[PDB]
Write a protein that binds this ligand. Structure first.
Ligand SMILES: [Mg+2]
Ligand SMILES: [Mg+2]
Ligand SMILES: [Mg+2]
Ligand SMILES: [Mg+2]
Ligand SMILES: [Mg+2]
Ligand SMILES: [Mg+2]
Ligand SMILES: [Mg+2]
Ligand SMILES: [Mg+2]
Ligand SMILES: [Zn+2]
Ligand SMILES: [Zn+2]
Lengths: 91, 53, 150, 68, 102, 83, 53, 98, 24
RNA sequence: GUGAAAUUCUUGGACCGGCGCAAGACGGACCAGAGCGAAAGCAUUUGCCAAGAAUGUUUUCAUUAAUCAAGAACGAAAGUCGGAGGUUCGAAGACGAUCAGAUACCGUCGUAGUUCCGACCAUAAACGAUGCCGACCGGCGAUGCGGCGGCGUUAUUCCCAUGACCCGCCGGGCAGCUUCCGGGAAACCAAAGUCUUUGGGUUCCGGGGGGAGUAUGGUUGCAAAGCUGAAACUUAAAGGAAUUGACGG
């Protein structure tokens, strides 16, 4: 059955730290402990090892990423901009 | 120009001066305000294009 | 009026009052059946088969010249598609919209169109399961539908 | 002042307030230009140089305007 | 009572029309509701054309026109007398007043 | 007119009216014989064809599908089928 | 040099108008504006041969 | 238009032609000289891709680098598992022109 | 009053009532 | 800067003119009783991505449909939360004026906000103050899209295609003018007609004015608030459309 109405993963914190802080950390913890689909082997086994470090259990590929998500939106936009500037630089 | 149209202007920035003569080179052109405003009319479409070249 | 659009278009096809095969049509029933079988082996849906037959081979209605409809002929020979054509195309459209949506999260218009498409899919599937064309436990799953089409 | 500094002709560039604000030149344009003409100064080209935004920031006064 | 069939604006098959600022008071007026006047006035007064022509360095100089489009809220349009109240029947005609060429 | 004869319309207004709104539905399309120059065989082509029709003996296009009617390639002869 | 001299009568706009007649007629076709974005180092000989011979 | 065409043709290769799914079976079919087309996901390891290309050159068979990945190639094949390499023995649908 | 300002006055009064009831 | 002023900036060069740099907003004029979208809404170029109405169809399925409690998606602006950004404008606030007073209208400055991304909220005169689907019932000239048919002009080219115009027809739209179709209390409406000659299908919803969209209960929401929602008591009128008169800074 459903065990909690809204706290979900931050039910481990009990009544402590405040509702807004628990709500704030809930999404970050979900993204932190989620298992991502590896873009090298295709298996959903890419998970965080340390802060910013993401490892895949299948192909043993370690990727440097975000603290809580596998990649940040900032880095994705940066990669797109770098690709655009590289293809502009040469002709 | 001796007998060209008058609604066209030129920028002609100065690069070098020798003696009492300032020497200019092309810097840009533009139409006059009245010509541009008179060209735009209703019940018609205008097409605007820009290109770096 | 359209099912999911506020459009009241009238563009249809006016089938002629003459049900007789035209005299210049030399094609016999077996020849048309062979053409349908070949075009089905090429992978054409019955709508495309009818379009090709009308455009190129000069047959007006397959039902008029053979006595049977195209899907009837395919099902009789046993090479009719497992999914109905329009249901297949609706699932294909929904899969395409979902593929576009998982990259463009802000496309709320695409979400609205996806909702409309899935409503159409479920209504068509309910009709087909009532007619027992589909298995009675047939269900459209948005996650696993992508392998069923294309 | 121009005559005592040896200038005999003048190109004219009329300007209004421009920008997001009004585009009609003030009451002084006509009299200033006519006085320049009647003072012996020669007149050359005339052109409007009012700043026209391709589109501007929000004009002051609120959405209900200047209530008077 | 519904005074006008079109509600005093040109919006027919639209939901929203972008607003414009009144040229007199800077009021946010819908673009299809505002009174528009496109004045094409000589850049010099008709009293001063002769003096400018005399003081021109050119012989056949064509004086510039001034192209200004004006937008008014109906408050400023009525107060500035460009538009006037009309009788109930006379409100229904859309033909602009004649130019008075002669 | 209070006494329009709905039973016997003349062919002019019968042809101008919409295909569905006629007294009896009649398609506006037809079938045509198409002669490609340099080829002897004859292809029966729909007047409103939605596909590119090709000669089986020559790699030549006969019609280009458009919004309403397939535009025949130039140099190609065509006639009607039984009105 | 021969860009500036050919935009002096705006032959570019005239051939643009001539080229666009098969799509939709155009009447007031001009190069409304050109601006100078980058310049090559100001070689004095080039400026001199633009002014002189 | 190329991606939708290859997806439709791959769907029609299934249910109508002889194929084989996977790396080991693809190599087996290639060295038996009966694989007429090899399709590779761009997710393929570069060493595996290069080796399969060398095998294809030796056997004179075509290689198509699929514009998806092993998950999407598996979906395009109609399967619920990832396929990274596959070989068509005979299409039955003119994916491979005579 | 203007109906909008009666609405605003009523909203202020409703907030005050909610506060007083919560105080118990 | 204003009706006039004043706060304010100014021999420290303020304002003005010129040349550049930086930033963030904003996409004029073209722009229309024009288009698209379920609405909210949507206007710089170019590319990509899916989507769509209308039209054409001698293509296919063959009743799969219309409206819909519960439920679901979207939902202007303002407001809330987190992160960027903050040019202008500008709630609050400060000051200068006006004034009998002036906590305002006017002016100067200026916070939140207005900008982007992510998450809430679910309200507008969210209007056509006008449910959806279907059928019938006047005329006319236009407009946008698609298709069809025709003198001709034009673009290149040698001709037809194909564009740009001209004249018509068909289908779907935004509308407009006229009408003793008919309706209505009338204003007005070709729908607000086809209604005592009352019945095409269906959904939501009103029962004199206040109290009151209030109290209470329940529920959603971080909050603001949203949804459901009385009663006591009070009142003989409140309202709608039109006419005459009076009055109008
Ligand atoms: Mg006033
Ligand atoms: Mg009134
Ligand atoms: Mg609105
Ligand atoms: Mg908002
Ligand atoms: Mg913030
Ligand atoms: Mg200010
Ligand atoms: Mg009903
Ligand atoms: Mg009551
Ligand atoms: Zn991996
Ligand atoms: Zn105003």
């Amino acid at each position: 059955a459903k065990r909690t109405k809204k706290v979900g993963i931050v039910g481990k914190y009990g009544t402590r730290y405040g509702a807004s802080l628990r709500k704030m950390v809930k999404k970050i913890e979900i993204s932190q402990h989620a298992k991502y689909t590896c873009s090298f082997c295709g298996k959903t086994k890419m998970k965080r090892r340390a802060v910013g470090i993401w490892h895949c259990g299948s192909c043993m590929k370690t990727v440097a990423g975000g603290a809580w998500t596998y990649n940040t939106t900032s880095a994705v936009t940066v990669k797109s901009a770098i690709r655009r500037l590289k293809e502009l630089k040469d002709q | 120009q001796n007998d060209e149209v008058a609604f066209r202007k030129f920028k002609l920035i100065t690069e070098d001066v020798q003696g009492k003569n300032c020497l200019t080179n092309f810097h840009g052109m533009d139409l006059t305000r009245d010509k541009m405003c008179s060209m735009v009319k209703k019940w018609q479409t205008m097409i605007e294009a820009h290109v770096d070249v | 009026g359209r099912m999911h659009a506020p459009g009241k278009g009238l563009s249809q096809s006016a089938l002629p009052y003459r049900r007789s095969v035209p005299t210049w049509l030399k094609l016999t029933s077996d020849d048309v059946k062979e053409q349908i079988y070949k075009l089905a082996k090429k992978g054409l849906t019955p709508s495309q088969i009818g379009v090709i037959l009308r455009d190129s081979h000069g047959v007006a209605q397959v039902r008029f010249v053979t006595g049977n409809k195209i899907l009837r002929i395919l099902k009789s020979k046993g090479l009719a598609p497992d999914l109905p054509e329009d249901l297949y195309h609706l699932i294909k459209k929904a899969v395409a919209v979902r593929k576009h949506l998982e990259r463009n999260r802000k496309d709320k218009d695409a979400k609205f169109r996806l909702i409309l498409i899935e409503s159409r899919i479920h209504r068509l599937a309910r009709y087909y399961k009532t007619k027992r064309v589909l298995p009675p436990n047939w269900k459209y799953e948005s996650s696993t539908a992508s392998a069923l089409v294309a | 002042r121009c005559k005592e500094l040896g200038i005999t002709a003048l190109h004219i560039k009329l300007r209004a307030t421009g920008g997001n604000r009004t585009k009609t030149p003030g009451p002084g344009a006509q009299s200033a230009l006519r006085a320049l003409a009647r003072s012996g100064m020669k007149i050359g080209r005339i052109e409007d140089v009012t700043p026209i935004p391709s589109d501007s920031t929000r004009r002051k006064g609120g959405r209900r305007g200047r209530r008077l | 009572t519904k005074k006008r069939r079109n509600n005093g604006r040109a919006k027919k098959g639209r939901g929203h029309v972008q607003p414009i600022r009144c040229t007199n008071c800077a009021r946010c007026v819908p673009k299809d509701k505002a009174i528009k006047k496109f004045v094409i006035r000589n850049i010099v007064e008709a009293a001063a054309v002769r003096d400018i022509s005399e003081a021109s360095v050119f012989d056949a100089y064509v004086l510039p026109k001034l192209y200004v489009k004006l937008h008014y809220c109906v408050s400023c349009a009525i107060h500035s007398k460009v538009v006037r109240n009309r009788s109930r029947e006379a409100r229904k005609d859309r033909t602009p007043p004649p130019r008075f060429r002669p | 007119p209070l006494a329009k004869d709905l039973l016997h319309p003349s062919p002019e207004e019968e042809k101008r009216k919409h295909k569905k709104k006629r007294l009896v539905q009649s398609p506006n399309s037809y079938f045509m014989d198409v002669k490609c120059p340099g080829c002897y065989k004859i292809t029966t082509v729909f007047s409103h064809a939605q596909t590119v029709v090709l000669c089986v003996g020559c790699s030549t296009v006969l019609c280009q599908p458009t919004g309403g009617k397939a535009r025949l390639t130039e140099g190609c002869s065509f006639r009607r089928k039984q009105h | 040099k021969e860009v500036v001299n050919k935009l002096i009568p705006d032959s570019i706009g005239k051939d643009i108008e001539k080229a666009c007649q098969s799509i939709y007629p155009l009447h007031d076709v001009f190069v409304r504006k050109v601006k100078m974005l980058k310049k090559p180092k100001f070689e004095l000989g080039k400026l001199m041969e633009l002014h002189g011979e | 238009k190329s991606l939708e065409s290859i997806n439709s043709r791959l769907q029609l290769v299934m249910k109508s032609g002889k194929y084989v799914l996977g790396y080991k079976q693809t190599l087996k079919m290639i060295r038996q000289g009966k694989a007429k087309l090899v399709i590779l996901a761009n997710n393929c390891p570069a060493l595996r891709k290069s080796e399969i290309e060398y095998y294809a050159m030796l056997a004179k068979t075509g290689v198509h680098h699929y514009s998806g990945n092993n998950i999407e190639l598996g979906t395009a094949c109609g399967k619920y598992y990832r396929v990274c390499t596959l070989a068509i023995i005979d299409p039955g649908d003119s994916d491979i022109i005579r | 009053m203007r109906a909008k300002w009666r609405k605003k006055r009523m909203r202020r009064l409703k907030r005050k009532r909610r506060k007083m009831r919560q105080r118990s």
